[PDB]
Amino acid sequence: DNLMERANSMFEPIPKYPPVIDGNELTQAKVELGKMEFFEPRLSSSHLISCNTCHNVGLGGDDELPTSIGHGWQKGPRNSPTVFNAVFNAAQFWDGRAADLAEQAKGPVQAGVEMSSTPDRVVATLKSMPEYIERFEDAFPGQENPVTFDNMAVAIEAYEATLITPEAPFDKYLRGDTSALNESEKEGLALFMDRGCTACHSGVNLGGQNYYPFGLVAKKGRFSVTETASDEYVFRASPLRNIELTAPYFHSGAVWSLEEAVAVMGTAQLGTELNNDEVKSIVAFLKTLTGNVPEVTYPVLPPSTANTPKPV
Numbered sequence: 136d137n138l139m140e141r142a143n144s145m146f147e148p149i150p151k152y153p154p155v156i157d158g159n160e161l162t163q164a165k166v167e168l169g170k171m172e173f174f175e176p177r178l179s180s181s182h183l184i185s186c187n188t189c190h191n192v193g194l195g196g197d198d199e200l201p202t203s204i205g206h207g208w209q210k211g212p213r214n215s216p217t218v219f220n221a222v223f224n225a226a227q228f229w230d231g232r233a234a235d236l237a238e239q240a241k242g243p244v245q246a247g248v249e250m251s252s253t254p255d256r257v258v259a260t261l262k263s264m265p266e267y268i269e270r271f272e273d274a275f276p277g278q279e280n281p282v283t284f285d286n287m288a289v290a291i292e293a294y295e296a297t298l299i300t301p302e303a304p305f306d307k308y309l310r311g312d313t314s315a316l317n318e319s320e321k322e323g324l325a326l327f328m329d330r331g332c333t334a335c336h337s338g339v340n341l342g343g344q345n346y347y348p349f350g351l352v353a354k355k356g357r358f359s360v361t362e363t364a365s366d367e368y369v370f371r372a373s374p375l376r377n378i379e380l381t382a383p384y385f386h387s388g389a390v391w392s393l394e395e396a397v398a399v400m401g402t403a404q405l406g407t408e409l410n411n412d413e414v415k416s417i418v419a420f421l422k423t424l425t426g427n428v429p430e431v432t433y434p435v436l437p438p439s440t441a442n443t444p445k446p447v
């Protein structure tokens with residue numbers, strides 16, 4: 136009743152359709168082409184990696200092992216965020232200097248198309264296959280040279296926008312089904328809002344909207360969340376939606392236990408102190424954020440040809 140009213144003033148349920156990003160209107164042809172690309176391993180120089188490799192849509196939309204590659208990354212290994220509902224995050228996954236945000240940061244959907252392979256190799260690869268040319272023509276009617284790096288990016292972004300998970304028990308609760316959550320989960324919800332977690336984890340994805348100078352450190356357990364030295368480094372407050380499916384946790388992916396993840400975020404400095412029973416209650420609540428994984432028909436990709444660059 137009032138709890139439901141409070142929850143609704145702090146959060147929102149996943150809608151049936153995704154918000155249009157940068158005026159990219161979704162169409163069947165764009166989404167279909169974007170899906171082919173999402174699963175296309177030949178965009179990588181080795182031909183062994185595709186988006187699905189690190190954002191497995193059948194296993195939480197992310198990667199189980201920290202990686203040092205992808206998106207032209209040139210530093211140490213980092214955990215991969217889930218592509219599920221990423222379209223609703225204004226901030227993107229960040230594991231670096233606050234000073235670099237201004238010029239290097241962008242929306243999740245857009246960060247998603249930052250590639251390690253060069254535009255030339257990618258375009259040449261796609262143009263080497265008749266079927267891809269036809270798909271680009273279907274997706275971009277009216278364009279004489281439809282196969283471009285920018286159009287590839289637009290198609291992938293259209294597909295990314297469709298990777299949303301509606302109908303989680305919590306969303307049903309927000310929409311009025313008071314029985315969608317049991318008493319144990321409702322206590323967790325009340326505590327999530329009463330212990331101040333909402334200062335950083337709120338809105339449609341319960342996080343993902345701002346950066347903070349607080350990150351996981353290897354000092355319950357052998358971990359803790361502490362402020363970075365001189366606030367030099369910042370992290371995006373994690374969107375907690377579907378957290379049940381997205382282990383391991385934090386920028387480093389060092390935590391596998393959801394209970395531990397909740398515990399290290401309860402601190403005096405953040406004004407989020409929790410006792411063991413409350414940690415368990417919040418865990419119960421967070422498990423109600425799992426939505427319906429979108430159905431995916433595995434795309435049948437076209438065969439390579441003499442002009443298709445060879446695996447390197």
Ligand code: HEC
Pocket residue numbers: 173184185186187188189190202204205206208213214215216217218221224226227228243244246247248291295
């Ligand atoms: C592993 C080698 C990866 C491959 C291949 C792709 N991605 Fe990825 N992605 C990876 C990591 C480690 C990260 C965070 C690091 C950083 O570079 O951003 C990401 C991030 C994203 C995001 C951002 C999600 C958010 O901020 O909420 C998206 C939407 C995303 N990745 C999409 C994406 C697509 C569409 C890819 C194929 C073109 C792709 N990634 C490949 C690791 C890896």
Ligand code: HEC
Pocket residue numbers: 327330331332333334335336346347349350351370371372373374375378381383384385386387396397400401402405407408409417
């Ligand atoms: C802002 C100052 C925060 C407050 C208050 C809370 N959290 Fe948080 N959380 C924040 C950040 C910047 C991060 C990422 C840190 C990093 O090292 O990567 C997180 C992360 C989490 C996670 C891990 C989620 C994931 O990887 O999917 C969980 C489970 C989490 N936070 C829970 C949580 C709870 C229950 C809180 C109230 C006690 C809470 N957070 C407060 C920032 C902030």
